[PDB]
Design a protein around this ligand. Structure first.
Ligand SMILES: *[C@@H]1O[C@H](CO)[C@@H](O[C@@H]2O[C@H](CO)[C@@H](O[C@@H]3O[C@H](CO)[C@@H](O)[C@H](O)[C@@H]3O)[C@H](O)[C@H]2NC(C)=O)[C@H](O)[C@H]1NC(C)=O
Ligand SMILES: *[C@@H]1O[C@H](CO)[C@@H](O[C@@H]2O[C@H](CO)[C@@H](O)[C@H](O)[C@H]2NC(C)=O)[C@H](O)[C@H]1NC(C)=O
Ligand SMILES: *[C@@H]1O[C@H](CO)[C@@H](O[C@@H]2O[C@H](CO)[C@@H](O)[C@H](O)[C@H]2NC(C)=O)[C@H](O)[C@H]1NC(C)=O
Ligand SMILES: *[C@@H]1O[C@H](CO)[C@@H](O)[C@H](O)[C@H]1NC(C)=O
Ligand SMILES: *[C@@H]1O[C@H](CO)[C@@H](O)[C@H](O)[C@H]1NC(C)=O
Ligand SMILES: *[C@@H]1O[C@H](CO)[C@@H](O)[C@H](O)[C@H]1NC(C)=O
Lengths: 134, 98, 48, 49, 48
């Protein structure tokens, strides 16, 4: 009905009154809408995932990299980042199988060892990373 | 019960007797424990410019990329603050090696 | 790209949003049948 | 957690809203357990040595 | 000492503001997103 927006839509359960047609956020942006034809309610959600941090051991030594997804549980990382909608080079770091779960989120591109050295490249929540032995 | 306005008090006056030939010496003592509180670290934070300013729109990002080296500077500043916080905590607490 | 350099040292880095994703378009409109009578105004025999 | 924001807990309780716009809060390096361990070590050293 | 920390709540005020003020500042930022800044309307996609 002229409301122009960009984001995924989901079936909602909000308790609209019969005379209402919008829904607003704390920042006062459109959040829920009602279909003009049939009386159903939709919740919107933006598509960017402000997010991922990148860990490198320095380009002067190696080009390998690791990625930390912040505050997202990595059972649903493919869904939350839209892995199937991106280039395969991103799907490589999405899939992983070198998947570690940390309090800060989920880390991909490194292996977890029991023995504990000093800290080399800080990460957080008590976890550090480093580049070594190939 | 009501609200009242007044000139506040400076404390309790207690004059001390002074003389050129007399001294005062204690006989008993006591032990006290006092508490003081010091802040150390503040909350880290980080901002993504393309998300905040030009949220998921192609035209806005295209116009923004010509401005360029603004949110890079912001990222550098916030990174400095974030690292400095951990530096403060490590300095104040990790004092003993063993 | 974010740091605008060809060299990068150690340490964690924060990245902006640069990935490009295609997106479809959807439009929803209500039922409507009759036509607007703009011609009647435009074909008025006399203007006040 | 982001999964909490995906669902319907309190309809964007002012933390999910500030995370959907790019703003983020980052972990401290040392959790409370390590700090408590340092504190206990210092206290024990003081009372013994 | 225990009683004091269990009785005088404001004794920890020095550690409370360092939180509250922080949050307040950040909140203001989000509200500034609703500003118009001299354009037709604050919604970007709308005028787009
Ligand atoms: C220096 O000051 C201290 C602190 O007041 C004096 O110790 C106190 O001495 C009195 C009397 O000797 C104690 O009171 C007694 O308590 C017992 C119960 O334990 C009761 O049965 C007695 O009838 C009497 O009331 C008091 O408890 C004690 N203080 C503490 C903390 O134990 C000390 O005597 C003073 N020294 C000099 C040289 O004056
Ligand atoms: C990701 O989600 C799963 C399930 O939603 C979490 O798995 C459970 O986590 C709880 C922690 O409260 C454990 O007590 C259970 O044993 C876990 N069950 C299984 C089957 O794994 C998982 O912890 C979440 N990841 C986090 C929180 O990092
Ligand atoms: C006019 O709007 C009505 C809304 O109820 C449409 O009627 C129903 O639309 C749903 C769409 O989900 C169909 O499943 C039903 O079969 C429709 N029922 C009837 C009795 O039509 C209706 O289709 C709209 N008009 C047109 C021309 O599509
Ligand atoms: C790595 O650092 C050394 C330091 O002397 C420098 O000479 C070298 O050029 C750097 N590597 C590259 C690829 O520039
Ligand atoms: C750590 O110890 C556990 C305990 O048996 C073991 O299952 C695991 O494989 C060990 N991991 C490493 C990296 O040594
Ligand atoms: C009425 O307006 C329409 C314009 O679309 C056109 O048919 C004509 O200009 C006018 N007169 C008649 C007789 O249609």
């Amino acid at each position: 009905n002229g409301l122009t927006g960009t984001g995924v839509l989901t079936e909602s359960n909000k308790k609209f009154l019969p005379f209402q047609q919008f829904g607003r956020d704390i920042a006062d942006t459109t959040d829920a809408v009602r279909d003009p034809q049939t009386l159903e309610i939709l919740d919107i959600t933006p598509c960017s995932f402000g997010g991922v941090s990148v860990i490198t051991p320095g380009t002067n030594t190696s080009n390998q990299v690791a990625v930390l997804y912040q505050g997202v549980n990595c059972t649903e990382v493919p869904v939350a980042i839209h892995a199937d909608q991106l280039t395969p080079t991103w799907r490589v770091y999405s899939t992983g199988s070198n998947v570690f779960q940390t309090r800060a989120g989920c880390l991909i591109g490194a292996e977890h060892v029991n023995n504990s050295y000093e800290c080399d490249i800080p990460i957080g929540a008590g976890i550090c990373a480093s580049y070594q032995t190939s | 019960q009501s609200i009242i306005a007044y000139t506040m008090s400076l404390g309790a006056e207690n004059s001390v007797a002074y003389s050129n030939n007399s001294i005062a010496i204690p006989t008993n003592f006591t032990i006290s424990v006092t508490t003081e509180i010091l802040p150390v670290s503040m909350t880290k934070t980080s901002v993504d410019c393309t998300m905040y300013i030009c949220g998921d729109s192609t035209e806005c990002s295209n116009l923004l990329l010509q401005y360029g080296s603004f949110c890079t500077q912001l990222n550098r500043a916030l990174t400095g603050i974030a690292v400095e916080q951990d530096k403060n905590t490590q300095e104040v607490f990790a004092q003993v090696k063993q | 790209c974010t740091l605008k350099s060809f060299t990068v040292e150690k340490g964690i880095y924060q990245t902006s949003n640069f990935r490009v994703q295609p997106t479809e378009s959807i439009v929803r409109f209500p039922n409507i049948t009759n036509l607007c009578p703009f011609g009647e105004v435009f074909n008025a025999t006399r203007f006040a | 957690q982001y999964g909490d924001c995906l669902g319907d807990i309190a309809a964007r309780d002012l933390i999910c809203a500030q995370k959907f716009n790019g703003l983020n809060v980052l972990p401290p390096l040392l959790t409370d357990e390590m700090i408590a361990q340092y504190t206990s070590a210092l206290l024990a050293g003081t009372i013994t040595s | 000492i225990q009683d004091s920390l269990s009785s005088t709540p404001s004794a920890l005020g020095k550690l409370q503001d360092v939180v509250n003020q922080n949050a307040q500042a950040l909140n203001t930022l989000v509200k500034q997103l609703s500003s118009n800044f001299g354009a037709i309307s604050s919604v970007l996609n709308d005028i787009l």
